[PDB]
Design a binder for this molecule. Structure first.
Ligand SMILES: OC[C@H]1NC[C@H](O)[C@@H](O)[C@@H]1O
Ligand SMILES: OC[C@H]1NC[C@H](O)[C@@H](O)[C@@H]1O
Ligand SMILES: OC[C@H]1NC[C@H](O)[C@@H](O)[C@@H]1O
Ligand SMILES: OC[C@H]1NC[C@H](O)[C@@H](O)[C@@H]1O
Ligand SMILES: [Mg+2]
Ligand SMILES: [Mg+2]
Ligand SMILES: [Mg+2]
Ligand SMILES: [Mg+2]
Ligand SMILES: [Mg+2]
Ligand SMILES: [Mg+2]
Ligand SMILES: [Mg+2]
Ligand SMILES: [Mg+2]
Lengths: 393, 393, 393, 393
C-alpha cells in the first residue's frame, strides 16, 4: 500500500504543523517550518498541500517578510512538484473575529473579514488552487438572543456572493467550497450540516460556483451518517472537495487519522468515492484531503507516521471496497436486497399520477400483506460487507 | 392563560389518542374515539385537528365503514367548529412499509405508497386542509450498503413531484410540507434535518409548492438549535407548518409537551414565532401544531391535562417573550450587542468588491487589535432574557 | 469460524424471537415457538439459551399451562443439550409496570414486582442458571419532580437485597447481575451506566453476590467507551455476565448484531474478553451472550443468518485479536508506548509519601521539559491494531 | 437576590481569570491579577475563592517568587475575609502531563505528578481548605490499545490512596473529591461519570476520606441527568463539593453560567441542594462553587456581570424552588403521584421474602389490570413545577 501523486492525497499545512495546544494545555511540539512540511509530504507521496493565509503568512507580517516566505514556499513547491489544490482563510484565531468574520455584529469587522478574504482569492489564484474553502467557525452564538438569525444569513450571503462575484470578475478558475460544522468553537454554528450548506447555496446570486467541503468528523458531531451526507452533496452535484479524518462520537472535534474513528463508515465512504453509486451517477474526482491532527502525545516521528497512516488507511479501505463490489456473491446479495431495483423509476414511461391511482393492481387490488413478506436480507448484505472489510473473504 | 381559536392551536389525533405502547410495552390506555377527541379539543380551545389517513380510517376498512367513520367525523367538526388544517399519510405502520414507502427497494411497494398518498390528497382536499405533510419515517437504512443513495433521492423526488404535479393538476389549494427526522424508526433517515429538507426541495420540479414541517424534538435529536433551523426555513420562506413538543437530549423521540424539554430554547422559539426577527423579515403565520404523546404513566385525566399544558406553555412563553422585547433595558442591551448593527449591509451602496479591498480603512490601515476590544455583552443580554423567562423582571 | 459449545455463545429467546414491532409499526414476522428456537440454536452451535419468565410462560397462564410449557421446553433442552445459563424477569411490558417494578411509586406494584422476581429465582434455580439478570427498564422518570431520588434507591436497594438474601437462604448457586441503561423506555433510568451500577452494589447488604451485566449498546447510548467500562467492572471483580451487540451512535437502542456497530470497539472488546490484560490480571470466563434484535426488514432466513453472524463476527475478531497480540512488531510498539511500564508501581517498595516528596530527582530536580519530549507513539500503535483488524498483517 | 457570605458561593480563580484562548484562537482579555480577583469577588458577595497551584504560582517560579506571591495573596484574603475552601492541582497544562499525571504510561512522570500533588496538599492544609479536588483530565486515551486498562486503575488507586494516607498521617482536616469527566481533553477520560467515580472510591484503602466533586456540564456531556447523579452521590454520602455551570448539549465543555444551560435541570438541582428530599434524608451543606468560563466575546464588564449572574440565577431559582415546594397544590399533586408513597418500605416490618411470596394478595390473587389504571399524574405534577419556575404561580 504505497501512495502515488496519482492518488491525489492532499494535506493541510495546519495538520502536520498542529503543535498540540488544546483548550487545557500548551504545545507539545515545536513549530513546523513550511519548507520542511513541503519536502516531507513529497517524500511520503502527497500530491499537494493546502493552507490558510496565516498558516504561512503571519497576521502581522511586513511586506518584505511576505515576499520572502512566499519565495521559500514556491521554491519548495518548485523543487518537489507538489500542487496547491485548495487555499482557505483564517477568519477565526485573531480576537477581532471573536464574533465571526462575515457575520460579526460589528460592521467594521464584517468589512475587514471580507477584505482579508478578497486578498486571499488573489493569492489562491496565484498559487494555482482550483478550490477556495470557507469554514465559518466563529459564525454563530452561545445564546439565542445574540443574533438576528435572518440578518446573520443575509450577512453570510453578502460575503459569499461578493467573493464569488469577484472570482467571476477576475476570471480566476476558482470554486468556493463551504465547510459546515455544527458547533465548536461557538456553541451553535450557522450552516451546521451538509444539508444547511446545500440549502443556503440555493439562495445565492452566484451559487453556481459555490459548493461543499464536508468533513467526516463534523457530520459525526451531530451524529449524522457521513456517507449519506456526501451522497446528497453528490446527487446535487455540489461535492467540490472533502476533508477526511476520524471521529469517535458526539464530542469535541478529535480530528483523528482517517479510519481511526468510525471504520465501517470509513469503509462505505471509500466505497462511495471509488466505486460510485451502484446504479451509476456522478463520481467524486477531487483531491482526497486529510484535515486531522497528530495526537499531542506523539513527537515528530509520530507526526510523519500519522500522515502516512492517513494514506495507508485510505489505500487499504480502497482495496477492500474494490474486492467487495467485485465479489460475485456480493452482487447477487445486492440484487436480492433490491439495490438495483431501487434504480427503476416508480412510474411506467408516460404513466400519470391519475393513471396510477386508478390502476387497480398498484392500489385497490394490491395485496399488501403478501408484498410485506419479502425478506430484504439487508443483514446478510451487511455481513458480507463486514467480511470484506476484515479481509476475511 | 386561556387559549382561543384565534390562537390557532392544532393537535394531531394520534397525539391525545396515543394509547401508550412503546418498544418495551403495551398500551396503558383504551383507544380514543375520534368523535370524543374532536369534542374534548373544542372544549379545550383547540382551533383544529389533524390526522393520518389510518388514524381515522383503518387500513382494512370496507367502503361502507369508510363512509360512516367520515360521517361521524365531519358531524363532530360541524358541530364544534374545528378546522382540519393538515392531513398526512401513514407510510410507516403496516409491515409492507418496513423498507419505506417512496424509497422502498421494492418497486411494487413504491407504487402502492404513491397511490395511497394520491388518494389521501383527494381526502386532504375534501377536508379543507391547506397543508399536506410528508414524514418519511421508514425512508433510510440500518446499514450503509442497503441502498443506492443517489437512487433513494431520485425515488424520493419522483414521489414528491408526482404528488405536487397532481395538486397543481387538480387545482387543490394544498402545499406539501416535508418533515425531517435524523433517525427512529430507521438507524439513519433520509433528509435528516431542516437543512437536508431545504436542499432537496431545490431539486424538485415542483418545489414551489413544497416546504418544511420542522419538529422541535427531531432537530434536538441531532443536537441542533431548533430556533436556528426554523430561522433558516423562514429566511428561505419554506416554513409551511411547525410541530411543537419537548425533547430532553439526544435519545429516542420523547415527544414531551411543548416546553417540557429545553425551556430556554422553547422561549426563543416562541420569541421567533411571535416577535419575528429583530430587524424584520418574514413571520410565521401557520397553525401552531402540537405533536406530542401524553406520558404512558398517566390515565385520561392526564391526557386532557397534557393537551391543556401544551397551550398554557405556549401562552406563558408568549407573555414572557412580549414583555422581554418590550423592556427598554432589553432594547438598549440589544443595541449594545450589535443586534441591530448586524442588519446593516456590509458594503456601502454601490461599493464593489474591488472598491472594498483597496479601501485602506477597511483593510490595510484597519486597526484589528483596537476593534477586538469591543465588549459584545452577550452574557448580560442572555441574563436579561432568562430574567424575563423566570418572570423576575 | 464454526462455533462450538466451548465458545460459550448464548442467545436470549427474545432476540431471535423478536417479531419486529417497533414504536412506529407492527411485527413483521410470525411468532417463534421456543421449542423451535432451542432446536434451531443448538444446531447453529450455541451453547445455551436465556429467557425472561414471560418470554416462555405467558403473564396470563394457568398452572397447568405453565407445566405443559416447561415440559416441552425441558424436553427440547434434553434433546439438544443446550443449557440455561441465565434467567431474567419481565418487569416492563405489562401496563402495571408503567412506573417501574421495584421503584414504582405505588407500594402494591412494588410488592407485586418483587414477588414476580422471587418466584422467578425459584424457576432459575430449577433451570440450572448461575446468573439471574435484573434490568430496571421502567425504573426512572421523564420529569425531575416525579420521584424522591433518595427513596427510589432505598426501594431499589430493598428489592435487590431481598432477592439476594432469598438466594442465600435457599442455597441456590446463583448471582444477581444488574444491567445498566441510561434511557429508553424512561427518559432517565436509574443506574444509567456501568459506574452507577457498580457504585450502587457497594451500598447493599448482600453485595457479595451482586455484580453487573454490561451491554454494548447501552453504554454506547451515553457515548461511553465500552472497553473502558467492562475493564472497570472486571478490575472490581463484578463482571458477572455480558450482553454483546451493536449500536451506531447515541440514539434509540438498535440491538444490531455484534460488530455491526462500532467495529474498532468490538475488536478491543473481544481482545479484553479473550486475551485479558497486557500486564496480566483478571479475566472474564462467563458466557458470551448476544442481546440483539434481527432487523425487521428481513424474514426468518435473516433471523438465522443474524444469529450465525453474531458468532462469526466474534470468531473473526478473535483470530485478528490473537494475531495482533502475538505480533512481535506489536509487542515492540507496546513496549515503546509504555503499555508495560504502566504496570510498574509508582512508588518503590517500601517508599513512603514523605520519601517521594523529599526525593529531589522526582520533583525538585526533575527535568519536566526533558520528560515532555517522549514520543509515546500511540498513533503508530493504533495503526498496527487497525492493520491487524483489516486482516492486513 | 443580593448574595451574602452565608449563601456559600465560591469561585475558582481560573474561571473569572480565563482570558479566552480556546482551541481555535488566542486570549481576548488581558490576564487578571489574583489580588484584584480577590478584591473583586469579595465585593460581589462571594464567600470564598478556589485555585489550582499554577493558577497562583507559576510552574517555573522560584521559592522567593512563590513566597512573594502568597504574601500578597494572603494579605488580600485578610483584607477581604474571603476563605479558601478548596484547592486543586494542575496535572494537565504543561506538556509533561500529555499522557496523564497519575496514570501516565511513563513511571517518572507518575512520580512527578504525585509529588506535585503531595506538595499541594501541604499548601492546601496551610490555606484552610477542607476539600482537595482531583480532576484527572489527561487520564485516559484516544485509542483503545494505548493502555492496559487494569493497570491504569491500579496506578490511579495508588496515587489517590498515597495522597489520602498522607492526609491521615499529617492530620490535615481535608477530604479528597474526584471530579469525573467523560471526555475532553482525552477522547476517553477514566472515571467518566459520577457512577464510575463512586464505584472506584469503594476499591481504595482510604475511601473513607474520598468522595466526589460532580460538575453539571460534565455529566451533561454524557447526556445524563445531573439531579439523578448528584442524588446518588448524596444517597451514598459522597457529595463533598460541587461545580455548577451550564451546558447546552452533548458537545465540548461550554462552562456557561449556571442556568444558561439546561434551565429546568438547574431548577431541580437547586431544589435538591436547597430543599433536599421530599420524604427527608441527606442534605448537602458544602459550598456552591461555580466552575464556569466568561464568554470570550465579552470584555471585563461581562466578566463581573457573569460572576454576578451565577449568584443571581441560583438565588432566583432558589425562591421559585421554595415557593414551589411550599405550594399546597403541589403538595397535593405530589401526594397523588405517589412521591410520598415511594418512601414507604415495600415489605412490612418483620415480613420475609418467603412471607411476601406466600401472600396471595401480593402476587397470586393480585389484580394487576386494576393496579394498571392508576393515573400517576406525572404530567400535571411537571406542569406545576414549570409554572412555578416561570414565576407564574
Ligand atoms: O478553514 C478551513 C479549515 N480550518 C480549520 C478548521 O478547523 C478545519 O475544519 C477547516 O478545514
Ligand atoms: O407523518 C406525520 C407524523 N407522523 C408521525 C410522526 O412520528 C410525527 O413525527 C409526524 O408528525
Ligand atoms: O431483561 C434482560 C433484557 N431485557 C430486554 C432488554 O431490552 C435488554 O437490554 C436486557 O438484556
Ligand atoms: O481541576 C479542577 C478544575 N479544573 C479545570 C477543569 O476544566 C474543571 O472541570 C475542574 O473543576
Ligand atoms: Mg475537524
Ligand atoms: Mg476541515
Ligand atoms: Mg416526534
Ligand atoms: Mg411530527
Ligand atoms: Mg439493547
Ligand atoms: Mg441486554
Ligand atoms: Mg467544565
Ligand atoms: Mg469543574
Amino acid at each position: 500500500v504505497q501512495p502515488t501523486p496519482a492518488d491525489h492525497f492532499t494535506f493541510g499545512l495546519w495538520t502536520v504543523g498542529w503543535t498540540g495546544a488544546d483548550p487545557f494545555g500548551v504545545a507539545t511540539r515545536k513549530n513546523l517550518d513550511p519548507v520542511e512540511a513541503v519536502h516531507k509530504l513529497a517524500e511520503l507521496g502527497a500530491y499537494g498541500i493546502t493552507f490558510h493565509d496565516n498558516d504561512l503568512i503571519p497576521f502581522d507580517a511586513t511586506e518584505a517578510e511576505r515576499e520572502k516566505i512566499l519565495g521559500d514556499f514556491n521554491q519548495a513547491l518548485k523543487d518537489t512538484g507538489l500542487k496547491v489544490p485548495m487555499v482557505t482563510t483564517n477568519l477565526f484565531s485573531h480576537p477581532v473575529f471573536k464574533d465571526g468574520g462575515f457575520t460579526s455584529n460589528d460592521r467594521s469587522i464584517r468589512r475587514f473579514a471580507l477584505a482579508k478574504v478578497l486578498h486571499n482569492i488573489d493569492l489562491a489564484a496565484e498559487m494555482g488552487a482550483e478550490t477556495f474553502v470557507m469554514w465559518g467557525g466563529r459564525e454563530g452564538s452561545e445564546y439565542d438572543g445574540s443574533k438576528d438569525l435572518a440578518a446573520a444569513l443575509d450577512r453570510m450571503r453578502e460575503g459569499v456572493d461578493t467573493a464569488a462575484g469577484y472570482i467571476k470578475d477576475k476570471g480566476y478558475n476558482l470554486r468556493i467550497a463551504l465547510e459546515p460544522k455544527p458547533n465548536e468553537p461557538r456553541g451553535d454554528i450557522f450552516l451546521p450540516t451538509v444539508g444547511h450548506g446545500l440549502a443556503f447555496i440555493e439562495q445565492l446570486e452566484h451559487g453556481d460556483i459555490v459548493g461543499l467541503n464536508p468533513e467526516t468528523g463534523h457530520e459525526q458531531m451531530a451524529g449524522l451518517n457521513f456517507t449519506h451526507g456526501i451522497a446528497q452533496a453528490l446527487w446535487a452535484e455540489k461535492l467540490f472537495h472533502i476533508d477526511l479524518n476520524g471521529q469517535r462520537g458526539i464530542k469535541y472535534d478529535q480530528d483523528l487519522v482517517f479510519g481511526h474513528g468510525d471504520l465501517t463508515s470509513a469503509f462505505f465512504t471509500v466505497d462511495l468515492l471509488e466505486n460510485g453509486f451502484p446504479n451509476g451517477g456522478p463520481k467524486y474526482t477531487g483531491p482526497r484531503h486529510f484535515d486531522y491532527k497528530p495526537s499531542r502525545t506523539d513527537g515528530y516521528d509520530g507526526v510523519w507516521d500519522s500522515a502516512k497512516a492517513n494514506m495507508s488507511m485510505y489505500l487499504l479501505l480502497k482495496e477492500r471496497a474494490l474486492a467487495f463490489r467485485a465479489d460475485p456473491e456480493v452482487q447477487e446479495a445486492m440484487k436480492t436486497s433490491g439495490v438495483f431495483e431501487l434504480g427503476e423509476t416508480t412510474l411506467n414511461a408516460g404513466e400519470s399520477a391519475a393513471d396510477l391511482m386508478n390502476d387497480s393492481a398498484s392500489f385497490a387490488g394490491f395485496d399488501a400483506e403478501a408484498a410485506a413478506e419479502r425478506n430484504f436480507a439487508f443483514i446478510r448484505l451487511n455481513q458480507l460487507a463486514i467480511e470484506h472489510l476484515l479481509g476475511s473473504r
